[PDB]
Coordinates of C-alpha atoms and ligand atoms in Angstrom, one line a residue:
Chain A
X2 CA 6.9 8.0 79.7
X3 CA 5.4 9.4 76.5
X4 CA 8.6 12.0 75.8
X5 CA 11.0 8.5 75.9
X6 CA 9.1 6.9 73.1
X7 CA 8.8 9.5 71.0
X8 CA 12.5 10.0 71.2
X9 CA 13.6 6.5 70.5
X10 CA 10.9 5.5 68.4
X11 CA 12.1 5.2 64.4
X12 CA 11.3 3.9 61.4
X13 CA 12.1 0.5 61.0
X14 CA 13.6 -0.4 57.5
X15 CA 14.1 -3.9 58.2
X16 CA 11.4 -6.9 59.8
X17 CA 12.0 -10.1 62.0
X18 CA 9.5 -12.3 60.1
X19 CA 9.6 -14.5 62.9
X20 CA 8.4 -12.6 65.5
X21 CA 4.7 -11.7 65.4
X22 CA 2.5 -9.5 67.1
X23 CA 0.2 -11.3 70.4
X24 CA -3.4 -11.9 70.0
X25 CA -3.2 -9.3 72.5
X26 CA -0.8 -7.1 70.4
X27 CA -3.1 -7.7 67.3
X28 CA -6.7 -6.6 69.2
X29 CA -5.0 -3.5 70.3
X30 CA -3.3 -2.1 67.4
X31 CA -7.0 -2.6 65.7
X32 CA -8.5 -0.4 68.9
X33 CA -5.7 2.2 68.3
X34 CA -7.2 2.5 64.6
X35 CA -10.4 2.9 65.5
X36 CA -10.6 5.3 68.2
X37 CA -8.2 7.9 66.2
X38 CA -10.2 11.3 66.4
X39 CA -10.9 12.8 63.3
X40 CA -13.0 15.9 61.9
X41 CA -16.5 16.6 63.0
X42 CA -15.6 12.3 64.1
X43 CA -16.2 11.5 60.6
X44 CA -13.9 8.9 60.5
X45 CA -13.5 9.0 56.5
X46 CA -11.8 5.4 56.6
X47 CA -11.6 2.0 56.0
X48 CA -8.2 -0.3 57.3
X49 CA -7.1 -3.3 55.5
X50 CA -4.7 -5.2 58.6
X51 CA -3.0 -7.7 56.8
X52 CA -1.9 -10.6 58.6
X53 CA -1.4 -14.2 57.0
X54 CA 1.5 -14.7 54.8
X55 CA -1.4 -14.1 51.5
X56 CA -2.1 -11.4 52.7
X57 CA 0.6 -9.4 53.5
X58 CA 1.8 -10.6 49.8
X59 CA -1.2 -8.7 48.4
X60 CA -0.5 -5.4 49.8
X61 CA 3.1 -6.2 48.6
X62 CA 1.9 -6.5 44.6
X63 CA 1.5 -2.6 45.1
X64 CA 5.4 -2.3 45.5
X65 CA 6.4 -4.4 42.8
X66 CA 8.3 -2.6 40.2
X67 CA 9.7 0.9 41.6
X68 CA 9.0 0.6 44.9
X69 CA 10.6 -3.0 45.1
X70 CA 12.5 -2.2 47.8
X71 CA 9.8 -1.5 50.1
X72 CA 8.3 -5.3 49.9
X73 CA 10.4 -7.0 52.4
X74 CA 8.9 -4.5 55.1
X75 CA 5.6 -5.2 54.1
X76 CA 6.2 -9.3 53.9
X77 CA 8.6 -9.7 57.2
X78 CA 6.3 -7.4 59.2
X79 CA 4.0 -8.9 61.8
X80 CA 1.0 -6.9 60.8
X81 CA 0.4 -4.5 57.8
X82 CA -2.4 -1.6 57.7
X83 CA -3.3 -0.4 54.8
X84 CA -5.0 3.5 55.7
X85 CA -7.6 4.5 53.0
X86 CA -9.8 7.1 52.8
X87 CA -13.6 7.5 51.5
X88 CA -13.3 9.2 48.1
X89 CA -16.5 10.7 48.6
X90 CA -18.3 12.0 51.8
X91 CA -21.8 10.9 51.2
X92 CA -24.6 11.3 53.5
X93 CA -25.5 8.2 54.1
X94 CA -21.6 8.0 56.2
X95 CA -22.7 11.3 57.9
X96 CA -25.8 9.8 59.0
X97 CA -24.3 6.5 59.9
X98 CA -21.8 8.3 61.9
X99 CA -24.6 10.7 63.2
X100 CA -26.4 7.7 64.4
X101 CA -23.7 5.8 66.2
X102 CA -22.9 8.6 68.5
X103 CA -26.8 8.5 69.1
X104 CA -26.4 4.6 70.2
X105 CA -23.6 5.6 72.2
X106 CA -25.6 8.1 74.0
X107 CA -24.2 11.2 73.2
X108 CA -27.3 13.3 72.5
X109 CA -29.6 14.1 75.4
X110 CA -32.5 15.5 73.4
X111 CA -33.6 15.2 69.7
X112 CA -32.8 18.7 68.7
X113 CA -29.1 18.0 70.3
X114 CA -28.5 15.4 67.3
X115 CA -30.3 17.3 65.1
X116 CA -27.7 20.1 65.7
X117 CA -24.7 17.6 65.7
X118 CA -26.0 16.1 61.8
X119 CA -26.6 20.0 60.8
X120 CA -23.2 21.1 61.9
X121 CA -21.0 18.1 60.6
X122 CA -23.3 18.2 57.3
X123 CA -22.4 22.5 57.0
X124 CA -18.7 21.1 56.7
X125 CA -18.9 18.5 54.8
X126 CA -20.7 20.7 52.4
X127 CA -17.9 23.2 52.7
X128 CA -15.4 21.4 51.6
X129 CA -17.3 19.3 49.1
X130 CA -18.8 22.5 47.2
X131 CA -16.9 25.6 48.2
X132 CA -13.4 24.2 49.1
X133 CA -13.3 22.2 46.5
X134 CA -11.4 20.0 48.3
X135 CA -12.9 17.1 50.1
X136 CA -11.0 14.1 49.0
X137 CA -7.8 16.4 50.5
X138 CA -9.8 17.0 53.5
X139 CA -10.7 13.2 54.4
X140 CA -7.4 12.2 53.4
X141 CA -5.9 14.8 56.3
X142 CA -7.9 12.9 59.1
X143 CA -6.5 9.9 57.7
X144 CA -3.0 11.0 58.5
X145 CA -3.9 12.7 62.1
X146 CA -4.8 8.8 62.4
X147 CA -1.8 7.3 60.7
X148 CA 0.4 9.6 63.5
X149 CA -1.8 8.5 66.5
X150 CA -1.0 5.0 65.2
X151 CA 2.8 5.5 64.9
X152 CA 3.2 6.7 68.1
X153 CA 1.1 4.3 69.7
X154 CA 2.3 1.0 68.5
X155 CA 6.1 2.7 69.3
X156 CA 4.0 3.0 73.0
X157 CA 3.5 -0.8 73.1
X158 CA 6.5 -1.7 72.2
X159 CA 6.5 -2.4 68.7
X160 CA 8.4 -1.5 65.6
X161 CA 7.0 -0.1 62.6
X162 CA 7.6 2.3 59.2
X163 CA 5.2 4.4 57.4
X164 CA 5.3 3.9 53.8
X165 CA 4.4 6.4 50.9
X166 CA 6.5 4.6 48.8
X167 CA 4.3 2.3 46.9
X168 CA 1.9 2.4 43.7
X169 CA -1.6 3.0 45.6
X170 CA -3.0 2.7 42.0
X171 CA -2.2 -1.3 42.3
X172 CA -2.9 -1.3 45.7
X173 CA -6.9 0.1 45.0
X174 CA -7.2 -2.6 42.4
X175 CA -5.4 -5.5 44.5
X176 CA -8.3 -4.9 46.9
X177 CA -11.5 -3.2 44.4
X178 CA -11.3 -0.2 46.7
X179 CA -12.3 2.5 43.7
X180 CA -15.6 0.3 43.5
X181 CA -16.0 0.4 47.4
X182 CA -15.2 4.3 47.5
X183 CA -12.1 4.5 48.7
X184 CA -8.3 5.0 48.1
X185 CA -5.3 3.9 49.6
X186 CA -2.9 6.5 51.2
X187 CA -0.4 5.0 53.4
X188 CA 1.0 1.1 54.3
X189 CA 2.3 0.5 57.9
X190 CA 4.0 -2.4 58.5
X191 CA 4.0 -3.5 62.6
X192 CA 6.4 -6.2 64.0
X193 CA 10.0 -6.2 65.6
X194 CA 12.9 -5.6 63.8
X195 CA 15.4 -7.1 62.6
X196 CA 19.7 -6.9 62.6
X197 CA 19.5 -5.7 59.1
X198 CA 17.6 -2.4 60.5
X199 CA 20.4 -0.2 59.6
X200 CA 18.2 2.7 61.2
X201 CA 17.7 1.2 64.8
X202 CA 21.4 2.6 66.1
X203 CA 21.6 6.1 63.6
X204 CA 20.9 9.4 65.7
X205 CA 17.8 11.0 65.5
X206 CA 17.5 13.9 63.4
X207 CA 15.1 17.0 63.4
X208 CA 15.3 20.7 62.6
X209 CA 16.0 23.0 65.3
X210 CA 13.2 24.7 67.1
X211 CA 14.9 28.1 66.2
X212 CA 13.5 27.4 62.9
X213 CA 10.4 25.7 63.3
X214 CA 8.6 27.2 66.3
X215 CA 7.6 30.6 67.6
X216 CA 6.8 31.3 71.0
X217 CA 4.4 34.3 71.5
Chain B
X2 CA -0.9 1.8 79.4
X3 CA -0.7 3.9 75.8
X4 CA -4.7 2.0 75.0
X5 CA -6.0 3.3 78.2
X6 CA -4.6 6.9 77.1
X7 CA -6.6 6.6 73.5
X8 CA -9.5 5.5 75.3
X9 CA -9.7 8.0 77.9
X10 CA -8.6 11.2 75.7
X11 CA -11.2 13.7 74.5
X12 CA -11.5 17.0 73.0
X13 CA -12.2 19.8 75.4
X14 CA -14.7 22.2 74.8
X15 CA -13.9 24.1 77.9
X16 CA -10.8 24.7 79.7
X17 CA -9.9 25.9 83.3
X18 CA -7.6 29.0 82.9
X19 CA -5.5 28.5 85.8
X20 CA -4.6 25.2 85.5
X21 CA -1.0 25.8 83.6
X22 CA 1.2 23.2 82.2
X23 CA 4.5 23.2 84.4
X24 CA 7.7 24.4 83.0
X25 CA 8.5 20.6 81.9
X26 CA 5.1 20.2 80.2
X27 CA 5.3 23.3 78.0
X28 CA 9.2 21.5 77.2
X29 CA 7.6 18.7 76.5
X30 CA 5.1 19.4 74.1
X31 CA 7.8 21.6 72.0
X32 CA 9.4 18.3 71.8
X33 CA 6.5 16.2 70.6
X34 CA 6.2 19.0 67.6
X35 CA 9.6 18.6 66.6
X36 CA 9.9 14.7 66.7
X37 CA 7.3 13.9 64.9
X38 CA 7.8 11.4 61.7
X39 CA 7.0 13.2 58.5
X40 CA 7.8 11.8 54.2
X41 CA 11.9 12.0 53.5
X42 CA 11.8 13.7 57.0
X43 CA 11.1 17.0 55.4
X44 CA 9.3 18.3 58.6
X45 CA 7.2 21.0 56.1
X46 CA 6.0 22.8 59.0
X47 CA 6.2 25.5 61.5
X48 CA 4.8 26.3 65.4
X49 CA 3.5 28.6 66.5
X50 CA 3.0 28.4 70.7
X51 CA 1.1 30.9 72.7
X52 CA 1.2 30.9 76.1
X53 CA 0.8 34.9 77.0
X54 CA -2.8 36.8 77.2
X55 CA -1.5 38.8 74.5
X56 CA -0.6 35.9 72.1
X57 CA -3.8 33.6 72.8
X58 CA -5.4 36.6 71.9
X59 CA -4.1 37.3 68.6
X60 CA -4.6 33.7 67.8
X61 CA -8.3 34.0 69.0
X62 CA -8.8 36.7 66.4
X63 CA -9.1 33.6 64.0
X64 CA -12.4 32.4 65.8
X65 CA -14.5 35.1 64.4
X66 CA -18.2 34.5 62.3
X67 CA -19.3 30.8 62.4
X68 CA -16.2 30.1 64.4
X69 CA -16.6 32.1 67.8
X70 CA -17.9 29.0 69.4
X71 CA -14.1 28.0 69.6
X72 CA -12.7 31.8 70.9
X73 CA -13.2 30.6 74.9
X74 CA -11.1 27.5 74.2
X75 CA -8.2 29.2 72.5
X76 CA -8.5 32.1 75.4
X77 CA -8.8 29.6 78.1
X78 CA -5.8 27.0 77.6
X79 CA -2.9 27.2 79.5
X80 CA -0.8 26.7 75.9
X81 CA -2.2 27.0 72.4
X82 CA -0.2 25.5 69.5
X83 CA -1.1 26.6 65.5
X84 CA 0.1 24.0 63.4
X85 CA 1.2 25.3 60.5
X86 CA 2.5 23.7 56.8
X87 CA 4.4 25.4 54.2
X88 CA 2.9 26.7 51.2
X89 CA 5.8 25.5 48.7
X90 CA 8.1 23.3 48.8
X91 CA 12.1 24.6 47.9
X92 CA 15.2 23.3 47.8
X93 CA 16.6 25.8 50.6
X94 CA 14.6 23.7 53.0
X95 CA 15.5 20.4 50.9
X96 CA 19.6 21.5 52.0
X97 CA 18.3 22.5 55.1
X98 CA 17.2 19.1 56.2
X99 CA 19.4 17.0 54.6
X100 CA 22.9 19.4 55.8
X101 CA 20.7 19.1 59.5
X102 CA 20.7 15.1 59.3
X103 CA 24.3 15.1 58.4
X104 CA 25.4 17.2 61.7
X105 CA 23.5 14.8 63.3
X106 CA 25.5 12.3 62.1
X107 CA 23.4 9.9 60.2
X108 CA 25.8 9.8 57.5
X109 CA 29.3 7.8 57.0
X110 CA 30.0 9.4 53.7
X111 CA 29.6 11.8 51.7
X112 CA 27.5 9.5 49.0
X113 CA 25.4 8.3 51.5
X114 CA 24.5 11.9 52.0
X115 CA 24.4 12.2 48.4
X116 CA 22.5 9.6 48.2
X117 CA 19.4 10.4 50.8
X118 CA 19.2 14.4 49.1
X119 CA 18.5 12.9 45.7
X120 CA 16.0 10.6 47.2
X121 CA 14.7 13.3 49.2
X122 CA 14.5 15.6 46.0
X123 CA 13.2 12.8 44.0
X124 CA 9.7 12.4 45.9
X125 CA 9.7 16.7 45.9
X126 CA 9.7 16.9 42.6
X127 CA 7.3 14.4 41.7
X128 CA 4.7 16.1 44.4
X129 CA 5.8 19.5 43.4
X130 CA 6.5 18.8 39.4
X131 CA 4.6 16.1 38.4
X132 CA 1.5 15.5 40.3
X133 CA 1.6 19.6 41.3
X134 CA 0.1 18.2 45.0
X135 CA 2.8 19.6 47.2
X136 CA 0.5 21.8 49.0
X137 CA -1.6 18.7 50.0
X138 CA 1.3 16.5 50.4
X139 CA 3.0 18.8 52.8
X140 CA -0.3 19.5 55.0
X141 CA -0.6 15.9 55.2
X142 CA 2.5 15.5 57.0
X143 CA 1.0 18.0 59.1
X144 CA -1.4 16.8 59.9
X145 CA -0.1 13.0 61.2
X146 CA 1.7 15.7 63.1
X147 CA -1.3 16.9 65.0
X148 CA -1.9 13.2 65.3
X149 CA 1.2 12.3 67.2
X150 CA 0.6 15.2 69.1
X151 CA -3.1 14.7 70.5
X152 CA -2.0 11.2 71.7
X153 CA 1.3 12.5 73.3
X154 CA -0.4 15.2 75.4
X155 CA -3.2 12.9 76.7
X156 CA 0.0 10.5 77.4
X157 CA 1.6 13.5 79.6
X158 CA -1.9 14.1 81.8
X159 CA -3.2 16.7 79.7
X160 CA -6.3 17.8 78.1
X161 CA -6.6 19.1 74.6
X162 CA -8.9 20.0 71.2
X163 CA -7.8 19.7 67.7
X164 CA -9.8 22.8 66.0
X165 CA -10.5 23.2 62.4
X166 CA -12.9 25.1 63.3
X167 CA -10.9 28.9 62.5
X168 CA -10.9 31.8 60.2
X169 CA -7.3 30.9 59.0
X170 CA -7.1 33.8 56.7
X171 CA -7.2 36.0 59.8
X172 CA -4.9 34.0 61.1
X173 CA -2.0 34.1 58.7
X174 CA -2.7 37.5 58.3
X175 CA -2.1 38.3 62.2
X176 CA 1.2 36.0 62.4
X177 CA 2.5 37.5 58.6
X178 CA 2.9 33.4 58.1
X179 CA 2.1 34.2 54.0
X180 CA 5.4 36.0 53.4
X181 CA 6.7 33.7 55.5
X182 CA 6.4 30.7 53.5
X183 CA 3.2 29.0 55.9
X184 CA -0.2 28.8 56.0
X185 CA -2.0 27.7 59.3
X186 CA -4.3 24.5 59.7
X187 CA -5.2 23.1 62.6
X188 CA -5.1 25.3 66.6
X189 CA -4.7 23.3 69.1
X190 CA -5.4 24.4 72.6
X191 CA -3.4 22.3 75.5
X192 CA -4.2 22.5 78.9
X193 CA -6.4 21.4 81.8
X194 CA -10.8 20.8 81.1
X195 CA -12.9 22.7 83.5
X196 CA -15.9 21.1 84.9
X197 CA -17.7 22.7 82.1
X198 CA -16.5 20.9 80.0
X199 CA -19.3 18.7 78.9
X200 CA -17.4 16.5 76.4
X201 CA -15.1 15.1 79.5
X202 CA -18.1 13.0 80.5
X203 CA -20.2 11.8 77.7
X204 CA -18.8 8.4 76.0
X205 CA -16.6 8.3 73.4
X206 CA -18.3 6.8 70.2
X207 CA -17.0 5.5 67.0
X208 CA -17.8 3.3 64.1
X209 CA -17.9 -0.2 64.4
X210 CA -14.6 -2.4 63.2
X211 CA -17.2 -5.0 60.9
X212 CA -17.8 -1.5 58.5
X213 CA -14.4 -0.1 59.1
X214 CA -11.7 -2.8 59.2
X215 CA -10.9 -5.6 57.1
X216 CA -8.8 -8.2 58.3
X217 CA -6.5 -10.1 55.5
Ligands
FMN301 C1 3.7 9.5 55.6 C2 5.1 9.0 55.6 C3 5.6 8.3 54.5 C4 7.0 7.7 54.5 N1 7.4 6.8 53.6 C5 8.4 5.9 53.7 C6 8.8 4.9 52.7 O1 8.1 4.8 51.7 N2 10.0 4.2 52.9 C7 10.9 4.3 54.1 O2 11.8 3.6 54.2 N3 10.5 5.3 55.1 C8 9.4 6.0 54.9 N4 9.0 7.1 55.8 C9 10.0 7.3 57.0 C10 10.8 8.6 57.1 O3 11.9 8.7 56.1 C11 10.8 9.1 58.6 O4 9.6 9.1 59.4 C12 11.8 10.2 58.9 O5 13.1 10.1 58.1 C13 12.0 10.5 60.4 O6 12.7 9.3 60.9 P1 11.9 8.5 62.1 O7 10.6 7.9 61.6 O8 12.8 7.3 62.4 O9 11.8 9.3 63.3 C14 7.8 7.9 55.7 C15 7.3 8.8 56.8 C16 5.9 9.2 56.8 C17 5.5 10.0 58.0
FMN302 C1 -8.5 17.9 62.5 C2 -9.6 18.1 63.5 C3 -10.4 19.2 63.5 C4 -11.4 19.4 64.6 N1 -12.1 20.6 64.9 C5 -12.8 21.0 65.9 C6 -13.4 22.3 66.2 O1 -13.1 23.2 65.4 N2 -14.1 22.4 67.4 C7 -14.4 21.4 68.3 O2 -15.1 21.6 69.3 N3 -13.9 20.1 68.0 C8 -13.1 19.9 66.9 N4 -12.7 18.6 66.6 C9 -13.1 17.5 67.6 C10 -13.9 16.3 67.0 O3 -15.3 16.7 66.9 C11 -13.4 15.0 67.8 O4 -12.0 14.6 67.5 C12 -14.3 13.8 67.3 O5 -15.7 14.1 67.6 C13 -14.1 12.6 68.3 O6 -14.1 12.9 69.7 P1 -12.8 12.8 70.6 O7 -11.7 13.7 70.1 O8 -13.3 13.3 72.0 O9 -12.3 11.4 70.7 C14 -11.8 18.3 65.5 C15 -11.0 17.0 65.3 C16 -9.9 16.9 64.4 C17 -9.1 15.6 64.5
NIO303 O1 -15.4 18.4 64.8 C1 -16.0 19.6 64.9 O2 -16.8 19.8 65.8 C2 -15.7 20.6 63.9 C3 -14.8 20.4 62.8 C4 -14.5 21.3 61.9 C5 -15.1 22.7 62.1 N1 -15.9 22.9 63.1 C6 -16.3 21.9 64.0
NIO304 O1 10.8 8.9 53.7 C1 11.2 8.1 52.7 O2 12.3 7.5 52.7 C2 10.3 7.9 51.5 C3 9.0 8.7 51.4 C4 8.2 8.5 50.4 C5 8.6 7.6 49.3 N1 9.7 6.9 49.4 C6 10.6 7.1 50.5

């Protein structure tokens, strides 16, 4: 059940190199990352799943330095997914995305896609010139999918750790993501841990619903 | 089958009024909300649930002008959750959660507590001092909230919407959340789809992996 992995699920600090994810493993984590809802479906991503030893040791450049500590989890770990997000929301996306729903059969009639492109285009405008904050709002579906992905790969099984601690301005250049319109936010590292996860066996801990929730 | 659950979920744009989530469902989504991951565990956020006429109703208030396509489905769900971040990060909350982690016991000493509240107040400060994004940084976590969420619920049998689509000025104004410390987000209704609900059928669609992945 759903309730059980959510409570025993955890953030892994430490990786069994050894152990690596299934073919199977690997083609579903990549499904679990793609079919992530998001905003008017705008999907304002790209994923980088590192793999091979080189790669996984060219997300790790991004936490050399201050974030040193967090390189182990990114080498040891099965699989590591970079999340970016677009730096931009152009309109050639919003008709690319406007386009594949219309493969997919979505749209009965013309004037239903035609409503679909007007409506996600209204938003997008929104927050591009009235919000003033677009980049924000792109990076926020990026998160909704970086939860759906924590919980899912928990789901299947599989240890993992979301990481903020790293030097995304590294990471961007590691990969020429600025050029290619798009920022890294957060690094995920997927595998099975190891003995030297001192958080596998420490008690979960979260605020009290007394202070975080209201019933009405 | 946690793939099969991504696969099949959807957002419902219309929702059957007297289909209500049992007593253990409405438990269970309150614990989703509260165990969800969040940066330093600093679980920015606040719930709001409403399950009464009268409460759906003052959160409907919110889908008002372009939004009143989205009134039926806040009016119809069984449950409908505001997510909800704060607007400034303090150190009240900063002793709140690290004191909460301690009488949960994830602490052997007093310098290991000592230890994780200047970590915690490290990555604070330099959202809320230094790059002055702690507004953003908060709603993020928020957001992979909602994320966690979407997929738990569809994991439990239950249909759902993630709306962005709402007046949240009206919102925070009807719940008093600005003097509370919160700002509201992202409504999501929970509940059972009615066979109007023309989104339940149509295929799912999303980009395809060779523009949005990048295997390493
Ligand atoms: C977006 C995000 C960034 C985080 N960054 C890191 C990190 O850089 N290093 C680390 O060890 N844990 C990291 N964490 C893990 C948290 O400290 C954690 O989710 C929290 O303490 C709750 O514990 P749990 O995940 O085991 O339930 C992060 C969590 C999230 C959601
Ligand atoms: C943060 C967020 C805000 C959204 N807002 C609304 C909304 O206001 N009204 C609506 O009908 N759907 C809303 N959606 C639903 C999307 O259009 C949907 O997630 C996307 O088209 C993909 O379809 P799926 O959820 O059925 O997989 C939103 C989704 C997210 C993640
Ligand atoms: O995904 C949608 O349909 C949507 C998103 C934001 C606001 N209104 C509609
Ligand atoms: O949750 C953590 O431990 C964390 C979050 C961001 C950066 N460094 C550490």
């Amino acid at each position: 059940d759903i309730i059980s992995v959510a409570l025993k699920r955890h953030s892994t600090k430490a990786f069994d190199a050894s152990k690596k994810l299934t073919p199977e493993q690997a083609e579903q984590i990549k499904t679990l990352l793609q079919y992530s809802p998001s905003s008017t479906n705008s999907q304002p991503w790209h994923f980088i799943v590192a793999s091979t030893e080189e790669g996984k040791a060219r997300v790790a450049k991004s936490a050399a330095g201050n974030y040193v500590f967090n390189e182990r989890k990114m080498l040891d770990a099965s699989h590591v997914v970079v999340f970016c997000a677009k730096t931009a929301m152009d309109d050639v996306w919003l008709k690319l995305v406007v386009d594949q729903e219309d493969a997919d059969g979505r749209f009965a009639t013309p004037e239903a896609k035609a409503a679909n492109d007007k409506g996600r285009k209204f938003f997008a405008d929104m927050h591009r010139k009235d919000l003033h904050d677009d980049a924000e709002w792109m990076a926020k579906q990026v998160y909704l999918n970086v939860g759906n992905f924590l919980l899912g790969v928990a789901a299947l099984g599989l240890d993992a750790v979301p990481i903020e601690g790293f030097d995304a301005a590294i990471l961007d250049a590691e990969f020429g993501l600025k050029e290619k319109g798009y920022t890294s936010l957060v690094v995920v590292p997927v595998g099975h841990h190891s003995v030297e996860d001192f958080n596998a066996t420490l008690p979960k801990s979260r605020l009290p619903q007394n202070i975080t929730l209201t019933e009405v």
